[PDB]
Write an enzyme that holds these catalytic residues in place. Structure first.
Site, PDB file in Angstrom:
ATOM      1  N   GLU A  53      -3.744  -5.700  11.155  1.00 18.54           N
ATOM      2  CA  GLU A  53      -2.775  -4.460  11.178  1.00 18.54           C
ATOM      3  C   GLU A  53      -3.027  -3.520  12.657  1.00 18.54           C
ATOM      4  OE1 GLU A  53      -3.030  -1.974   7.609  1.00 18.54           O
ATOM      5  OE2 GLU A  53      -5.130  -1.230   8.587  1.00 18.54           O
ATOM      6  N   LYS A  81       0.012   4.196  -0.198  1.00 21.26           N
ATOM      7  CA  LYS A  81      -0.875   5.520   0.536  1.00 21.26           C
ATOM      8  C   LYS A  81      -0.689   6.714  -0.152  1.00 21.26           C
ATOM      9  CE  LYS A  81      -0.426   2.887   4.693  1.00 21.26           C
ATOM     10  NZ  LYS A  81      -0.088   2.823   6.315  1.00 21.26           N
ATOM     11  N   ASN A 135       0.788  -1.124  -0.119  1.00 21.90           N
ATOM     12  CA  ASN A 135       0.030   0.197   0.020  1.00 21.90           C
ATOM     13  C   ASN A 135       0.849   1.287   0.049  1.00 21.90           C
ATOM     14  OD1 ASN A 135      -2.191   2.037   0.439  1.00 21.90           O
ATOM     15  ND2 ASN A 135      -2.595   1.319   2.430  1.00 21.90           N
TER      16      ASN A 135
END
Lengths: 245, 245
Positions: free
Chosen positions: B162, B10, B8
């Site tokens: 997570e 982001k 990811n």
């Protein structure tokens, strides 16, 4: 003040249907006296900027307040400029009332998109209950001060008054309802910033603008153009760009 | 259970730097037995899918819960498929704790994404205060039920654990802390869904994974891969893909 109309496509389209819409706008005869910008879904921004003629600007529908970092789902002014878009729409009715963005957050986003060199379409507007409580002035001056506190240079800002009761409902503000607020907003700019900013800043109206009602709204003295939603996806968007002709 | 690593990115990158990162990944020696997907910013999803090799999947970082509509700033499963991406990350720690997305909303998004045919990487995780209070199991099982109650077909779901205290901080969970939660979540799946779903659903770990600690974590019995944040933007992402070699 150059007449301005932004089309906000909101969460609509795919490459085939937006390619078709873009071919319509590129083939159409659009007034050279109108500044046109289309606000595409973030996933179609690059495709839109590559397809659209250069006289038509591209706007992102939303952005975050810092250049990079751990904010999954967000995009920054740096990324919008990378794709070639020149504008971002901030503070729209759905961002405020469906996604809960605050005045403070919209204010931080405005200061950062402007520092990053983007133009900002900043939206303000009252709800049905506020309009009926007679506090429309109090509400929009409060949202406008949140934005103003974050603007150093007003030459890249366009304010968009979009009464929440008029978005996607079909209940358009009357010409006299839109003029009354635009004129009050422009006086707020005159007394809180300067007369020079009051006189040069475009204040556009949004909320169920169609081909059928745009010419009478465009004839009001302080209505500088429109922010168009549902009708930005139809050929009648060409008639709204051309409302003063 | 095929090893899965999702990167990811982001809110990071531009076309130059993500183009470099993509050229690296396309030419790398990546394990034939690992399933890789990259979670790109919405504005670069089309770019990212055009440039990455077909063996590497592309994931959106968020989506909304209906196909079209007046949701400025959002994108839908339909647009994500249109671009060629096959996955969406839902319920990530920043969407939950920074942007306030609730379990009810994440649950609706999962149902919709899967109904449109996208695979979903659904994220869950507890805060440091809930870990210290002894209620890690209570929190990850109520966030997993909100997801599970909205899943009709598990073929396309990858669960990502997570712990919020481990994201961006460098405070990785130890192999033993990761294995504890992954083993309990697989046990919840056996008794609330079925054994066949518990046995084939990948459960991956995210929160400060690096090329230095990925091998220890990957040898745990119930850790089926990783959801990498910061290290997915670096060359070492290739070592995490190859964490079992």
């Amino acid at each position: 003040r150059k007449f301005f109309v932004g089309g906000n496509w909101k969460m609509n389209g795919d490459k085939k249907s937006l390619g078709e819409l873009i071919h319509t706008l590129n083939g159409a005869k659009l007034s050279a006296d109108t500044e046109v910008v289309c606000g595409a879904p973030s996933i179609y921004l690059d495709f839109a900027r590559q397809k659209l003629d250069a006289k038509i600007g591209v706007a992102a529908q939303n952005c975050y307040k810092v250049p990079k970092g751990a904010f999954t789902g967000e995009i920054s002014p740096a990324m919008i400029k990378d794709i070639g878009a020149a504008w971002v729409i901030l503070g729209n009715s759905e961002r405020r009332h469906v996604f809960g963005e605050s005045d403070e957050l919209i204010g931080q986003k405005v200061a950062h998109a402007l520092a990053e060199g983007l133009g900002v379409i900043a939206c303000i507007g009252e709800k049905l209950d506020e309009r009926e409580a007679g506090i429309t002035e109090k509400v929009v001056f409060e949202q406008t001060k949140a934005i103003a506190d974050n603007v150093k240079d007003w030459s890249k800002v366009v304010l968009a008054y979009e009464p929440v009761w008029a978005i996607g409902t079909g209940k358009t503000a009357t010409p006299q309802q839109a003029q009354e607020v635009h004129e009050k907003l422009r006086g707020w700019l005159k007394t809180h910033v300067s007369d020079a900013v009051a006189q040069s800043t475009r204040i556009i109206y949004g909320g169920s603008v169609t081909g059928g009602n745009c010419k009478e709204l465009a004839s009001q003295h302080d209505v500088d153009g429109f922010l168009v939603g549902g009708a930005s996806l139809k050929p009648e968007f060409v008639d709204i760009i051309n409302a003063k002709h």
